Design a protein around this nucleic acid. Structure first.
Lengths: 188, 225, 98, 133, 116, 60, 61, 283
RNA sequence: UUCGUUGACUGUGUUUACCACGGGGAAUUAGAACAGAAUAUCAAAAAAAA
RNA sequence: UGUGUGAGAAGGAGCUAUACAGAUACAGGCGAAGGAGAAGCGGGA
């Protein structure tokens, strides 16, 4: 073996071309900024009005109504979660002394990382199925119920996500590319 | 095999392993497999509010500023376009009551209940669960678990006669799980104690189990009033 | 009134319930807005929809800047039913919306 | 105070005002409706409930309304809560908690700098709840 | 050979010493403004590896104030009292407000060092 | 199991000339042993010469 | 503290006197505490004080 | 799984004011100490890398994604999070008004709010992620259903669906599922903390035992080997008495003399507080 | 909260920690009073067909 | 009721006269929460 090697995380510049190009473009940048600032209306003068007094009152009323109804709806549930939560602790405290350690663990429990030199109850690694996904399991039904604007926003969200994570697959398939020696890292 | 059922319930046939006791009560484990609905539904107010907000925004010109340079990106997944341009086995099936939360129940001989299994001294509860699932339910059956802690427990004492054996009673610790969509149904092995299985709703649940059994887990199930 | 989850769901609040649900704003300090030249007094109440045109924007979620209203920190949003009887009967005229 | 508690706790036919999470202590916020008219004595009902709560194995810390209203400010209440808690949770030197000494800021003749509860001061970052008396 | 003469060599030496420590014993009448215990804000390196006692400061008790240099001063007309802390293994100074009167031998018990 | 522990290293630091403290208690060692009766200074060269003589006399 | 404490009233105020073991002894401490309790009994310092206003409703906190 | 020498990077520089050099400002003491005050480090003196496409660029993309998903979903998740932690027990329904027949979203929340007099503006302010930690926490845990799905959905194209249409029974589902995944063990940290610690489950004092059937008496006998009562007690509870002898030596003796009768330091530190599961009292 | 502010104000008095003196100045109280101008926080809201 | 105290051209690697009109004073308020995993941005209110 080499007997002396230490790698550190590294992101090659060639793999991030999409992100870089998107960011450096002024036309796109401006648009991005615009999207962040939805109204983009002047707010630095007394002679400014977003809405007339008559328009705001209906908004207020609707908001109030919405909230009023939703609270009422939700309280019923809240009581149930409460009730349910009551029982879990009871059962946990009732377990034997030797089984207590396993009753205070998370779903994603895993052993600590071991940096071995170069050449129980935990059985399987945590892996959330895709099937169980809300979006996964209800996308087809919701998709058809989406509106024009909704669809538009969906498209834009997709685009932005893609932009943010271009090399997701690349990383997955060839993780070793995203690694460089410590001496090379600390001398860039 | 009735011997396994008798060894499970009663203590007359001794098992082939050492049992784990707790204050004279043997530790047990259970499982409850539930399924999510298949059809999406929305409240009434939600729609109203949404519609109103959309309309108002549109009217007042207060909506998001979506540029043409972002929304028109050439990507493989592209399905978007302008509308103007567009003009150019009655209780064992998994497809029962799509808009309901179905619960799994087994039948021990002539009694409807949840699966049960004893805990081996030195073994973990997850191991017990695993074994339970792989022996009573099906060989290739492996539902997704929600956690390691239980949610409910109960106590069951033996009559005055069987108490002379040495075991005072039982200790059950109920557990919850979910059914992975797209998976097959159960497959009872030849050497399993379960005689039958069925999927039932919250509403119909009380009609199978006794109140005693009902109450022990009524505070852990989902609310569908 | 409601007595079940379905009734809760299909609940129809009355005009009295909506009036109780009406939002109000309360002042803290006796300050004068440097922008609008609007005086403020302590213990007074006003409608959120007419207290300040600019503040409403932020409150509703149409402004990322919190500094839009100099006297914004001096605001206390509450419900009409939360207000005391005394206060209600005093500023009843200024809270109407006819 | 960095103390975990539950408000409006249900323990059967009895409703507790505040219930602690870490320790067995229930704080009762007595109001004017819990006492007779022009008097300083509790009612039969509340006495009974107190009795029951005691029997249950839970300590009860009373808080009268006239004592709370006098302590107008938060500085006078922060140290009083501590003191009260201590007096209840103490295991050593058991005696009648009736004729005990009391000295709070802004009520009693004392120096302004004479504090008890330092602003954001906790040894070993241990919560007050967990602190052992 | 050679030798570097230190700047603190004779006659150039520190004449004023850091008189750090307690200044009032138990059962000692004091009035506001008097310094009970003197301390210094300067801390040396490796404090946990020394034998000396002056490297450790005392905590305030009752009717005491902390000055700019971490000095403990009284706040009322009374007697000085000392107390030990088990939770911390550190002494604490306490002042009991008392009026000017003859100190009897039967009241000495009131000023005893107790553990808390 | 048996091991060949490494000997300490000399300290290149100037120290006082203070006195030699007494012993805590008698040291018990199996087999033959040689001990002193009075306190005194011993040099590394002296100890090394004693070790060499002992090894030569006893053998390999 | 490993001490025998005895409670008593003084100047319309509660107070206590300790008796450490390390001073007297294992056996002596208890004897001294009981002897002091007898002196307080004779002096009448064990009686609890009281405060009255004479008007119904008016009290002292 | 991937395997490579991850190594460890050097610590970051904290910095300090250009004042005070003879003394030691690094004493390892509790904050706000009345005797050992801690030196303040102004924020402006902390070295920071220049803003670039890496530091600032991606923050813009994350903020645009958050704007598209909507701040109301973040506020609802926050509310839920805050509420779930103070209503672990059955509670009497609470009304926001003295009279009428209205309801509230949450009793514990209502109480808390009414008590603390939390600013209405400050609730809205936070949702915009003014700071960098709010953006990093949205990137790591941004999904609506994060209590359920962990960070699984942190790279999902179709994630806005959750934030748009996840109300009702579905919402309840999330709450139900999260409680069974939350942590319940002990915490081990060093740095200062200003917050109410999470609930910790207590441990029992009644361990289990193994038994096996025996036909010679038709009875279940314990598998443990018979021993003296003294031994049994010793093994179970511990040494009997206020004190005992030290532990024996495992390792072989030392070939040369070693002054093992000397303590580590002339002055040992004070004892540390006890931290761990509590004993369960008999009901 | 991305919150306020300039008190880092202006006068009367000869009592006090330490003490060769000097510099009350390795740096102590509300001298708890008196005569002006500023900033910050309020308090209260119980009783739900027995 | 039990503490203060570094003299000798003795030892050591003591040593820097500096900062701030404020995200360095600053009322009120907030403030860091195991391990595994994602990201490769030295970020607590």
């Amino acid at each position: 073996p080499k007997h002396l090697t230490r790698y550190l995380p590294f992101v090659p510049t060639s793999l991030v071309h999409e992100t870089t190009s998107f960011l450096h473009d002024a036309t796109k940048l401006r648009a991005l900024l615009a999207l962040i600032f939805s109204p983009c209306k002047p707010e630095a003068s007394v002679a400014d009005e977003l809405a007339s007094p008559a328009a705001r009152l209906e908004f207020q009323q609707e908001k109030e109504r919405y909230h009023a109804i939703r609270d009422q709806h939700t309280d019923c549930y809240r009581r149930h979660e409460s009730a349910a939560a009551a029982s879990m602790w009871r059962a946990i405290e009732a377990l034997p002394s030797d089984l207590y350690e396993e009753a205070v663990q998370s779903v994603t429990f895993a052993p600590p990382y071991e940096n071995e030199p170069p050449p129980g109850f935990y059985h399987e690694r945590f892996a959330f199925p895709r099937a169980l996904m809300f979006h996964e399991m209800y996308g087809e039904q919701i998709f058809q119920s989406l509106s024009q604007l909704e669809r538009r926003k969906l498209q834009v969200f997709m685009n932005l996500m893609h932009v943010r994570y271009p090399h997701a697959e690349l990383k997955r398939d060839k993780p070793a590319l995203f690694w460089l020696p410590e001496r090379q890292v600390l001398s860039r | 095999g009735t011997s396994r059922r008798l060894s499970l319930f009663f203590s007359d046939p001794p098992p082939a392993y050492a049992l784990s006791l707790h204050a004279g009560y043997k530790i047990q484990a259970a499982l409850c497999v539930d399924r999510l609905p298949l059809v999406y539904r929305e409240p009434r107010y939600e729609k109203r509010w949404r519609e109103f907000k959309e309309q108002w925004e549109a009217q007042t010109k207060n909506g998001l500023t979506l540029a043409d340079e972002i929304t028109f990106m050439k990507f493989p997944f592209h399905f978007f376009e302008t509308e103007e341009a567009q003009k150019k086995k009655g209780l064992r099936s998994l497809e029962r009551e799509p808009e309901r939360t179905l619960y799994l129940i087994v039948r021990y001989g002539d009694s409807w209940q949840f699966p049960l299994e004893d805990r081996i001294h030195g073994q973990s509860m997850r191991s017990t669960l695993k074994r339970l699932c792989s022996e009573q339910l099906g060989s290739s059956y492996a539902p997704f678990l929600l956690g390691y802690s239980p949610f409910s427990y109960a106590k069951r004492t033996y009559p005055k006669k069987t108490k002379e054996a040495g075991i005072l009673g039982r200790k059950i610790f109920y557990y919850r799980a979910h059914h992975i969509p797209g998976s097959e149904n159960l497959k009872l092995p030849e050497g399993s104690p379960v005689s039958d299985f069925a999927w039932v709703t919250l509403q119909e649940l009380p009609a199978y189990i006794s109140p005693r059994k009902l109450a022990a887990v009524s505070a852990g199930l989902l609310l569908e009033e | 009134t409601v007595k079940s989850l379905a009734a809760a769901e299909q609940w129809e609040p009355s005009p009295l319930t909506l009036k109780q649900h009406q939002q109000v704003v309360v002042w803290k300090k006796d300050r004068t807005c440097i922008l609008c030249k609007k005086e403020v007094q302590g213990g007074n109440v006003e409608k959120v929809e007419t207290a300040c045109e600019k503040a409403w924007r932020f409150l509703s979620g149409y402004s990322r800047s919190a500094h839009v209203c100099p006297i914004l920190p001096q605001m206390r949003i509450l419900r009409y039913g939360e207000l005391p009887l005394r206060d209600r009967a005093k500023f009843d005229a200024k809270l109407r919306r006819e | 105070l960095r103390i975990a508690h539950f408000c409006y706790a249900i323990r059967g036919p009895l409703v507790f005002d505040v219930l602690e999470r870490d320790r067995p202590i229930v704080w009762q916020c007595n109001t004017a409706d819990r006492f007779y008219v022009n008097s300083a004595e509790k009612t039969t009902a509340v006495k009974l409930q107190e009795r029951i709560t005691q029997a249950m194995g839970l300590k009860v810390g009373n808080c009268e309304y006239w004592q709370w209203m006098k302590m107008k400010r938060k500085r006078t209440r922060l140290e009083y809560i501590r003191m009260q808690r201590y007096y209840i949770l103490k295991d050593r030197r058991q005696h009648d908690p009736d004729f005990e000494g009391w000295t709070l800021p802004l009520v009693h003749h004392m120096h302004r700098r004479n504090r008890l509860h330092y602003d954001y001061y906790f040894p070993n970052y241990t919560p007050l709840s967990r602190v052992e008396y | 050979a050679s030798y570097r003469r230190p700047s603190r060599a004779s006659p150039t030496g520190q004449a004023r010493k850091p008189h750090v420590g307690v200044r009032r014993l138990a059962a000692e009448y004091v009035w506001p403004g008097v310094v009970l215990v003197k301390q210094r804000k300067v801390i040396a390196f490796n404090v946990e590896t020394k034998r000396r006692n002056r490297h450790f400061k005392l905590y305030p008790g009752e009717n005491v104030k902390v000055s700019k240099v971490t000095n403990l001063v009284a706040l009322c007309h009374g007697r000085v009292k000392f107390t030990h802390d088990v939770s911390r293994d550190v002494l604490v100074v306490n002042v009991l407000p008392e009026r000017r009167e003859e100190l009897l031998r039967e009241d000495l018990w009131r000023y005893r060092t107790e553990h808390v | 199991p048996p091991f060949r522990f490494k000997a300490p290293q000399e300290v290149r630091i100037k120290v006082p000339i203070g006195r030699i403290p007494p012993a805590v208690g008698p040291e018990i060692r199996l087999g033959k042993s040689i001990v002193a009766v009075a306190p005194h200074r011993v040099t590394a060269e002296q100890l090394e010469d004693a070790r060499r003589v002992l090894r030569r006399v006893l053998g390999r | 503290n490993e001490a025998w404490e005895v409670y008593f009233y003084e100047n319309l105020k509660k107070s206590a006197k300790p008796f450490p073991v390390k001073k007297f002894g294992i056996a002596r401490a208890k004897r001294e505490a009981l002897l002091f309790l007898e002196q307080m009994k004779l002096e009448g310092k064990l009686e609890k004080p009281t405060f009255s206003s004479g008007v119904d409703g008016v009290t002292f906190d | 799984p991937f395997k490579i020498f991850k190594a460890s990077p050097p610590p970051a520089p904290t910095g300090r004011k250009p004042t005070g050099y003879r003394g030691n400002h690094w004493h390892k003491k509790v904050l706000y100490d009345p005797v050992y005050p801690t030196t303040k480090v102004p924020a402006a003196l902390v070295p920071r890398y220049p803003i670039d496409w890496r530091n600032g660029g991606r923050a813009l993309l994350i903020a645009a994604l958050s704007k598209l998903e909507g701040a109301s979903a973040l506020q609802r998740r926050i509310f839920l999070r805050e509420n779930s932690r103070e209503s672990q027990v059955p509670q009497t329904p609470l009304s926001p008004f003295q009279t009428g027949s209205s309801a509230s979203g949450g009793g514990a929340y209502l109480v808390s709010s009414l008590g603390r007099k939390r600013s209405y503006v400050g609730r809205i302010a936070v949702s915009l992620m003014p700071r960098h930690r709010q953006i990093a926490d949205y990137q790591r845990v941004g999904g609506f259903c994060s209590p359920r799905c962990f960070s699984e959905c942190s790279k999902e194209l179709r994630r806005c669906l959750c934030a748009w249409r996840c109300t009702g029974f579905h919402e309840h589902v999330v709450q139900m599922d999260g409680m069974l995944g939350e942590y319940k063990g002990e915490v081990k940290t060093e740095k200062p903390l200003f917050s109410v610690l999470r609930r910790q489950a207590r441990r029992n004092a009644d361990p289990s035992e193994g038994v096996a059937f025996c036909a010679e008496s038709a009875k279940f006998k314990s598998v443990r080997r018979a021993q003296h009562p003294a031994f049994e007690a010793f093994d179970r509870q511990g040494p009997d008495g206020p004190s005992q002898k030290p532990a024996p030596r495992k390792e072989p003796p030392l070939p040369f003399y070693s002054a093992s009768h000397v303590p580590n330091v002339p002055r040992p530190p004070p004892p540390q507080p006890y931290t761990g599961p509590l004993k369960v009292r008999e009901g």
